[PDB]
Amino acid sequence: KIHHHHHHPPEAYSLDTAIFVLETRDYRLSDVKEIDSYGDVEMKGKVAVFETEYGPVFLYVYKGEEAKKIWKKLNGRVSIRSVLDLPNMGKFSTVSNGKKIVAWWRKNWLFIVEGKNGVEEFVKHVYRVYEEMKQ
Numbered sequence: 001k002i003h004h005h006h007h008h009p010p011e012a013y014s015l016d017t018a019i020f021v022l023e024t025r026d027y028r029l030s031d032v033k034e035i036d037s038y039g040d041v042e043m044k045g046k047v048a049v050f051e052t053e054y055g056p057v058f059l060y061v062y063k064g065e066e067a068k069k070i071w072k073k074l075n076g077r078v079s080i081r082s083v084l085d086l087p088n089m090g091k092f093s094t095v096s097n098g099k100k101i102v103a104w105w106r107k108n109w110l111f112i113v114e115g116k117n118g119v120e121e122f123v124k125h126v127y128r129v130y131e132e133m134k135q
Contacts, residue, residue: 054118
């Protein structure tokens, strides 16, 4: 492995635990729902809402072998966009009707974070929690 630590859980880790481990006194889980799609893009996963000092932030999570395929469909679906697209990982950031959206994939994980406020701060939190885990 080039990285023993990265911004996603280990490949064996539970999708549910990947959500629940993010909760702190400053990031309070308020909702969890299974999903089949993100808009018009098929994506069998879950979405969680965290209440933060900035307001609610939404985290969409997918675990599986099609993370890249889905992320590419998402990236192809806003006025402005920034995209890093590598063979084995990707990240984009965009804005849609006031909401910041950041979406990334690596290995068997795809995450989307969206919200009116506090998205970058929440993403950094997610990075920090996952980075501590051993791949």
